[PDB]
C-alpha cells in the first residue's frame with residue numbers, strides 16, 4: 001500500500017477527488033458529531049494538566065479533537081482506573097483529513113512533537129501519556145520520530161489503537177511502555193486503507209488500555 005497511497009495522494013491534488021474526499025470526510029464527521037451530542041459523548045478535550053495527562057490524536061474524520069469512537073472510552077476507563085488521581089485530557093488539534101492520512105501526516109507529527117514539548121515544559125510534574133487512534137497513531141509515531149530520546153523518556157506510556165504503522169516500534173522510546181491495540185482483520189493495521197468493522201470497535205479495549213497505563217503512571 002505505500003506506493004498506492006503515494007499515487008492516491010498525487011490524485012488528491014488533480015482538482016477532482018480532492019473536494020469529493022473532503023466533503024465525504026466532513027459528512028462522516030458531522031454524522032459522528034450528531035451521535036456524540038445525542039449520547040452525551042464529549043468529542044473535545046482541552047483540560048489543564050492533571051496528575052496524569054493524556055495527549056490524544058483522533059482518527060480520520062473523527063469530530064472535535066478526541067472523536068467519538070475511541071478516545072472518550074479510553075479516558076473514562078483511565079480515570080476510573082486512576083481513582084482519586086486527576087486525569088487531564090488534551091486532544092491533538094490537527095485536521096484528521098483523508099489527504100494527510102494518504103501522505104503520512106508528517107506536518108501533524110511535527111506539530112504534535114512541539115505540543116508534547118510545550119506540555120512537558122508547562123506541567124513538569126504531570127505523568128504524560130500519548131494516545132492515538134488510526135491516523136492519530138500515525139501522528140504519535142511521527143511525533144516520536146521528531147523528538148529526542150531524552151524528551152521521549154519523560155513520556156510515561158503510549159497507547160495506539162488501530163495503528164497504521166503496526167509492526168514498527170514508537171521511535172526513540174522504550175517499547176515496554178507502549179501498548180499497540182490492533183484487531184485481527186483490521187486492514188488499517190496491515191498498512192492498508194480499508195475501514196472494516198474490526199477497526200471501529202477499539203472502545204472495547206478501553207479497560208485493557210487503562211490497566212496497562214496505571215502501573216506506568218507510577219510511583220515513587
Ligand SMILES: CCCCCCCCO[C@@H]1O[C@H](CO)[C@@H](O)[C@H](O)[C@H]1O
Nearest residue numbers: 060098192193194195196197198200
Ligand atoms: C458491517 C460492514 C460495514 C462496515 C462499513 C465501514 C465504513 C467505512 O467504509 C470504508 O471507508 C474506507 C475509507 O478509506 C473505504 O476505503 C472503504 O471502501 C469503505 O468500505
Ligand SMILES: CCCCCCCCO[C@@H]1O[C@H](CO)[C@@H](O)[C@H](O)[C@H]1O
Nearest residue numbers: 073074200201202203204205206207
Ligand atoms: C459501529 C461502531 C462500533 C461501536 C462498538 C464499540 C464496542 C463497544 O465495546 C464496549 O466498550 C466498553 C468500553 O468502553 C466495554 O465496557 C464493553 O464491554 C464493550 O463491549
Ligand SMILES: *[P@](=O)(CCCCCCCCCCC)OCCCC
Nearest residue numbers: 028059060061098101134135188193
Ligand atoms: P483512521 O484514521 C480511522 C478512520 C475511521 C473512519 C470512521 C468511519 C465512520 C464510521 C462511523 C460509525 C457509525 O483510518 C485510516 C484510513 C483513513 C482513510
